[PDB]
Symmetry: C3
Subunit: 209 residues, 3 copies
C-alpha cells in the first residue's frame, strides 16, 4: 500500500529531522517531541549510534520512528529490522525504490527536479520530500513542480524555519514540512524542545484540517 | 530521425504551454494562437479532457499539436494515438526516452542538470527543454550548461516572460522558449491572445534568421 | 582503488578547467600552470583538438593531465588511450560510472543533487564535482549536501572566483575547487597565468595542511 506514507505525512505539520550525536539524548529528545505533538520522528542514519537511537525512541509511547538518510537497500533492511515505521532518503535511486516497494516499506524519498519525480512515479510512488528545499528554488520552485505533477504531494525539507513553514503549508500540495529547528544543536533543553513542538504542532495546513 | 524535434523548435520563437481547463476553449485558443503565428502548441496532459482537446486543436489548419506532461511510455502511446506531432515531458527517464526512440516519436524532454542531458545523449537525443528555467538558475545556469554541451540546443520553459524571452533568445544555443503568458488564466480573450502571439512571433532569435 | 581520485583532489587547491581553442597554446598553458604549482589539469573534450592537446600537455614534466567533459564510455576509452591520469564529467550516468570502475579509471563525476550522489555511492564512488556550483545554490547548497553525505568529499566547479575559492576551501568536506579564471580567454599570457596559479596554489584548505 503506497497510501501508508501519505497518512504518515498528514499526522503532524512538521517532521523533525534528528541528528543524534549523543545517544543518551535519544530518549529525552523523543519524549520532548512527542509531548509537543510532533511524534513523527526522522532519525537520520548519519551517526554511528543511529540504529540504537531508533530502538531507544521506539520505547517512547506514541513515537512514530522512521529512519532518515537511507541511502541504499542494505540501510533500509537494517532500519526495517530495527523497527522503523517509515523511511526517508535525500534522493531516489531505482534500486532503493524497487527494494522499498518489494519490502512493503513506507518510503518518503527526496526529489529535487522533475526527473526524480518521474522515476518515483514509475516505481509507484507519488509522495516525496522536496529536498533541499531552500537551496533548489524554495516555494516558487515547489509551486512550479506541484503545478506539473497534479497527483503528487510533497514534504519540503532543507532550510525550513518557523517563519517560512506556514507559508509552505498554505499550498494544498504540501502535506508537511521537515525541519531541524525544533531540536537546537547542543545539549537538549526538553522544555524548549516541547515548546517549539507545541507551536509547530499548531501550524495550519491547507491540506489537513 | 532525431532531427525532427530540432525542426519543430525552430518554427516559432515561443511554444505556448497550454493548460486547458475548459474543453470548450480548446478550439478558440488554438485558432487565436495560430492566427498570431504561434502554431506549435503544447497541450499538457494535466487535465481530464486533454486528449480530447488535442483532437479538437488538430482540426485547426496550421496547428502543430503536441502533448506535454508526458510522464511515461503509456501516456506517449495515448498521445501518439491521438495524433500528436511531438511530445514534451518535464523530465527524462530511460524508459520514456527508449520508448520514444523505438516509436519514432519526436520527444522534447525537460532537463535540469548535467546528468539529465547525459542520459538523453546516451539515448540519442540532443534537444531538451531547460525546465523549470527560472527556478534552476535561469539564463546564467543555462549558459553554463550550453558551454559544456556544445552540440545540445535548448528550449527554456518555466517562468519565462515577454521581457526575459528575447534575452534567452539572444543565446545561439537556445532555439525557442516555452511560456504560458500568451494564454492568460481565465476565459479566453481571443483578440488579446492573438495580439500576444503576434508579438512573440516577432521575437528575434540568434539561432533562427 | 577508489582512493586514487581523492589523492588527486588533494594535490592542489585549484584544478584549472581548460578549454583549448588553439592547440598551439596547449604546451605554453600547461607549462605556465605547472610553473605556478597548479599541475593537476583538466583538459575538457569540448574542442576538436582536445585529445591532441592532452598528448601535448602530457609532455610537460610534472603535469598531471586528465580529460574533462567525458560524457560516455567511448570518450573515456579515447581519453584513457591518450594517457589521461583522471577523468571528469559534468554529471554521472550508470553506464559511464560502471565503465570507469571496470576500467580502473579515476573518475571525478559531477553531481548537482542528492540522487546523483546516491547513484555514485551505489557504483562505489564517493568523490564528486559539485557542478555547476554557483548555479545550483553555491556554498549554502553544498553545505546542506555535505551535511547529509558525511563520507563524501567535493570539488565545487562552475562560477568559482579567486574571491570565493577560499570560502569554499574553508569547508572540511571540500578538497579543492575547479575554475577557469587561471587561464583568461584570449591568447595566453604565460606570466599572468603563472602568477594566478601561484596565488591559487597558496590557497589555504581546511581539508589539506
Amino acid at each position: 500500500a503506497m497510501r501508508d506514507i501519505d497518512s504518515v505525512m498528514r499526522l503532524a505539520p512538521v517532521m523533525p529531522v534528528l541528528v543524534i550525536e549523543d545517544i543518551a539524548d535519544a530518549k529525552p529528545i523523543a519524549e520532548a517531541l512527542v509531548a509537543g505533538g510532533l511524534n513523527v520522528l526522522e532519525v537520520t542514519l548519519r551517526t554511528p549510534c543511529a540504529l540504537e537511537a531508533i530502538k531507544i525512541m521506539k520505547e517512547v509511547p506514541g513515537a512514530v520512528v522512521g529512519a532518515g538518510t537511507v541511502l541504499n537497500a542494505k540501510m533500509l533492511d537494517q532500519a526495517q529490522e530495527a523497527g522503523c515505521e517509515f523511511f526517508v532518503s535525500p534522493g531516489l535511486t531505482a534500486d532503493l525504490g524497487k527494494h522499498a516497494v518489494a519490502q512493503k516499506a513506507a518510503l518518503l524519498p527526496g526529489v529535487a527536479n522533475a526527473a526524480d519525480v518521474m522515476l518515483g512515479l514509475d516505481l509507484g510512488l507519488d509522495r516525496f520530500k522536496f529536498f533541499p528545499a531552500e537551496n533548489i528554488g524554495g516555494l516558487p520552485a515547489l509551486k512550479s513542480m506541484a503545478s506539473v505533477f497534479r497527483q503528487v504531494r510533497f514534504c519540503p525539507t532543507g532550510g525550513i524555519t518557523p517563519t517560512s513553514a506556514p507559508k509552505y503549508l498554505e499550498n494544498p500540495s504540501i502535506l508537511c514540512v521537515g525541519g531541524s529547528w525544533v531540536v537546537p544543536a547542543g545539549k537538549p533543553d526538553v522544555a524548549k524542545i516541547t515548546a517549539l513542538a507545541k507551536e509547530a504542532s499548531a501550524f495550519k495546513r491547507a491540506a489537513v484540517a
